[PDB]
Design a protein around this nucleic acid. Structure first.
Ligand SMILES: [Zn+2]
Lengths: 180, 205
RNA sequence: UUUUUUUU
RNA sequence: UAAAAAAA
């Protein structure tokens, strides 16, 4: 339940951004895929009132009602990379549920450019969650899946194609050099 | 197949058409990703610059449909030889459109449109783009009950039947349905310079 | 979302 | 005052 404009307003993030200065917030998009009966659920979480969308989505999974029998391959396409502390909350919540396997795909490597948020997401890509930045498909996946692709179109048909490619080309190599 | 059909490919298209006796030609170049189901195309009118709606030409641009790895991609395997397709579109007000096309990328199209009413939504340009239409596939045949949006409300319906035939025999798939969405990304006032975007993905029936 | 460097 | 690119 997103807007086509909001997609590029929050997911598209260049090295030097657009004409308005830093009008950007953090979003998360969880795609829970129960393969038992092929019963998928989807949802977006804005960065809410001093509770990062990671903790909000963790509490959503908590208070929604889980099924301890089968395994879930949950994908999560998020705009801004998770910070240090909520990444540790995420890995602690994933260690308690062995029937969960999560993939994390970010759009921009958001952090305070200090030391804690460097290894805060290095444990994920090395212990439980393969963490890489978005490319072409995961954007195209999150584009029509989460953001409503209904009748109207807010003049963003393929402008992302070049911006998605710039973001991939730069930040994916950045994230690979980080993981290495 | 994957070694010759790269993840990014361009094409060139030449169309000769005649609608209600008005002859014209269209030259275009495009680019996209065949395995991800996205493509864009830029067209230019070279003759007759069009007295009719451009939307009747958009559904004619199919080798860029995303197929799962466990579903044989019938249209991709036809290359490098290519394929042909022939389409008949009967509009509800008597308009008829017959299209033939060869794909080898080099596309050669021949189009003939006849019997369009002078006060109909096609010749009067009262259309607002095509609605989403799920085409069920089962040579390969496809039938569409397509709906054209009207400016004043309602829909303008048409029956479309298309036959796609590959130049080389390959394994035919089972029953499936393709979700397709086409968008006009940019156009001038007289629709002489048009860019189009297409997304297509197959699903099990 | 904060720094450092090169070029037009 | 615009904009291209790279390092942590
Ligand atoms: Zn956080």
């Amino acid at each position: 339940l997103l807007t086509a404009e909001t997609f590029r307003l929050q997911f598209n993030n260049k090295r030097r951004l657009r004409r308005p200065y830093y009008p950007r917030k953090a979003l998360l998009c969880y795609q829970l895929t129960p393969q038992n009966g092929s019963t998928p659920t989807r949802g977006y979480f804005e960065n809410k009132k001093e509770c990062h969308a990671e903790i909000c989505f963790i509490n959503e999974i908590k208070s929604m009602g889980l099924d301890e029998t089968q395994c879930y391959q949950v994908t999560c396409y998020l705009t801004w990379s998770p910070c240090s502390s909520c990444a540790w909350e995420l890995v602690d919540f994933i260690k308690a549920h062995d029937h969960l396997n999560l993939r994390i795909f970010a759009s921009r490597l958001y952090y305070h450019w200090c030391k804690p948020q460097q290894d805060g997401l290095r444990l994920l890509c090395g212990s439980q969650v393969p963490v890489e930045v978005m490319g072409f498909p995961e954007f195209a996946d999150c584009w029509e899946n989460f953001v409503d692709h209904e009748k109207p179109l807010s003049f963003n048909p393929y402008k992302m194609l070049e911006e998605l490619d710039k973001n991939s080309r730069a930040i994916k190599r950045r994230l690979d050099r980080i993981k290495q | 197949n994957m070694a010759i059909i790269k993840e990014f490919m361009r094409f060139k298209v030449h169309m000769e058409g005649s609608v209600n006796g008005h002859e014209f030609e269209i030259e275009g170049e495009g680019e996209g990703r065949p395995y991800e189901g996205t493509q864009t195309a830029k067209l230019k009118v070279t003759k007759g610059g069009l007295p009719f709606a451009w939307d009747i030409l958009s559904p004619q641009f199919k080798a860029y449909v995303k197929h799962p790895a466990d579903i044989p991609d019938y249209l991709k395997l036809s290359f490098p030889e290519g394929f042909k397709w022939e389409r008949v579109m009967n509009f509800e007000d008597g308009g008829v459109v017959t299209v033939t096309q060869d794909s080898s990328f080099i596309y050669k199209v021949k189009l003939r449109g006849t019997n369009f009413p002078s006060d109909g939504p096609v010749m009067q340009k009262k259309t607002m783009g095509w609605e989403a239409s799920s085409e069920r596939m089962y040579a390969l045949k496809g039938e569409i009950k397509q709906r054209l949006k009207l400016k004043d409300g309602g829909h303008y319906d048409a029956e479309v039947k298309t036959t796609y035939k590959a130049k080389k025999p390959v394994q035919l798939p089972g029953a499936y349905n393709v979700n397709i969405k086409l968008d006009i990304t940019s156009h001038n006032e007289d629709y002489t310079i048009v860019e189009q975007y297409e997304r297509a993905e197959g699903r099990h029936s």
